[PDB]
């Protein structure tokens, strides 16, 4: 694990985003065994574990690329699930609570 201020900030931000997912429903890839048609509709699955692996492999080089993968967690969920579902309501909540986390983190990244 390589240590730079930027990577430490992304590590901290990822932890703050996962803290908002109190049910851990976005912690790991959507289980394709339970959902055989998921890849028919979703082109780029995303979850917080995949993000952590991307981060630890030093594959997020800028804040934009990190935030883009977070936005996929949300947008994939809203796309696949009906509005009256626990998952869709959870994605809406994550979008709201995670947006405030990202705003403050992005401001700190811009000063690097
Ligand atoms: C299909 N799908 C998505 O599109 C998605 O965005 N997310 C976030 C999904 C998340 C999950 N898991 C939820 C539990 O933590 C691990 C991930 C599943 N797994 S599951 O076994 O299908 C399942 C489990 C529970 C429940 C259900 C289904 C149905 C509602 C009641 C609770 C599927 C997800």
UniProtKB/Swiss-Prot annotation:
High levels in testis. Residues 1-105 form the Bromo domain. Acetylated by KAT6A. It comes from the Eukaryota. It is found in: Nucleus; Chromosome; Cytoplasm. It is linked to Intellectual developmental disorder with dysmorphic facies and ptosis: An autosomal dominant neurodevelopmental disorder characterized by delayed psychomotor development, intellectual disability, delayed language, and facial dysmorphisms, most notably ptosis. Additional features may include poor growth, hypotonia, and seizures. Component of some HBO1 complex composed of KAT7/HBO1, MEAF6, ING5, and BRPF1. Component of the MOZ/MORF complex composed at least of ING5, KAT6A, KAT6B, MEAF6 and one of BRPF1, BRD1/BRPF2 and BRPF3. Interacts (via PHD-type zinc finger domains) with unmethylated histone H3 at 'Lys-4' (H3K4me0). Interacts with trimethylated 'Lys-36' of histone H3 (H3K36me3). Interacts with ING5; interaction directs BRPF1 to H4K4me3-enriched chromatin at the 5' of active genes. Interacts with KAT7. Scaffold subunit of various histone acetyltransferase (HAT) complexes, such as the MOZ/MORF and HBO1 complexes, which have a histone H3 acetyltransferase activity. Plays a key role in HBO1 complex by directing KAT7/HBO1 specificity towards histone H3 'Lys-14' acetylation (H3K14ac). Some HAT complexes preferentially mediate histone H3 'Lys-23' (H3K23ac) acetylation. Positively regulates the transcription of RUNX1 and RUNX2. This is Peregrin. The chain holds residues 628 to 739 of 1214 of the full protein.
